[PDB]
Amino acid sequence: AMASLINLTPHDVTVFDGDTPIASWPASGTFARIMEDVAAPAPMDTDQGFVPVSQVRYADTVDGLPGKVSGTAYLVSRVLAAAVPRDDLYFPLDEVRDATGRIIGCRALGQFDH
Amino acid sequence: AMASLINLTPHDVTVFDGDTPIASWPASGTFARIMEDVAAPAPMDTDQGFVPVSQVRYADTVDGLPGKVSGTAYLVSRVLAAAVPRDDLYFPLDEVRDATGRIIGCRALGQFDH
């Protein structure tokens, strides 16, 4: 039935119903992500000239993502949710922005269908 | 040797060396992405109250991504590049922002190491 969500993204997540925030989860301080190692750039010859290109290697595990348990689930980046086919991962869906374009909330959470 | 890059993202991609744009590729109008179908939200019972959650289904192919050829490669979203382990996909790396936080360029391109 009821679950609590822990926010593993760098920003507070707030769901808006119209102008009313109906749920909010503070950034936990932990950022669930697949860690990377960005190599120094090497030059690529393009029509536009020489362009720096870095190879990016990624870990085989996720950092900052707790284990599944009954009754707790996780707010993560959409990119992580796409990469990790777990059914306890939720991401902000339908971003709500202020006039400057800054994200202040979302209209729903999303879950990838597996 | 030399390659041209087609920009399959919604924004112009400009690589900066310091304050100087050393390469730029205009948005082609085609956005390479795995297409989605977002279901109507269903309620999830959370400690924060009832929250709308949409299931998101994704296609088995990529839309807007041309076939590999010698001498042409593709600028795509980092999220697509992560999902599709092709060696002709490049994404903006090390975003350069103006004072308002708007992305105006990048310092390099990235490629995921396979």
Q: How many CA atoms lie within 13 A of A41 on its CB side?
A: 18
Question: B8 to each of A57, B57, B71, how far by Cα in Å?
Answer: 23, 22, 16
Which tokens hold the place of B11?
């924004």
Write out the two tokens for A40: 């120094």
Cα distance between residue A83 and residue A87, in whole Å: 12
Q: Is A71 in the B-facing interface, judged by CB distances under 8 Å?
A: no
Contact A52 B15 (CB under 8 A): yes
Contact yes or no for B22 and A54 at CB 8 A: no
- Chain A nearest-CA distance from B40, in A, is 10
Contact A51 B109 (CB under 8 A): yes
How many other CB atoms are found less than 10 A from the CB of residue A93? Answer: 19
* PDB resolution in Å: 1.1
> Distance (Å) from the C-alpha of residue A64 to the closest C-alpha of chain B?
19
| Beta-ladder partners of B51 | B44
Domain ranges of chain B: 4-34+61-110
Q: Kindly provide the b/e burial profile for residues B14-29, where b requires at least 16 CB atoms within 10 angstroms of the residue's own CB.
A: bbbeeeeeebebeebe
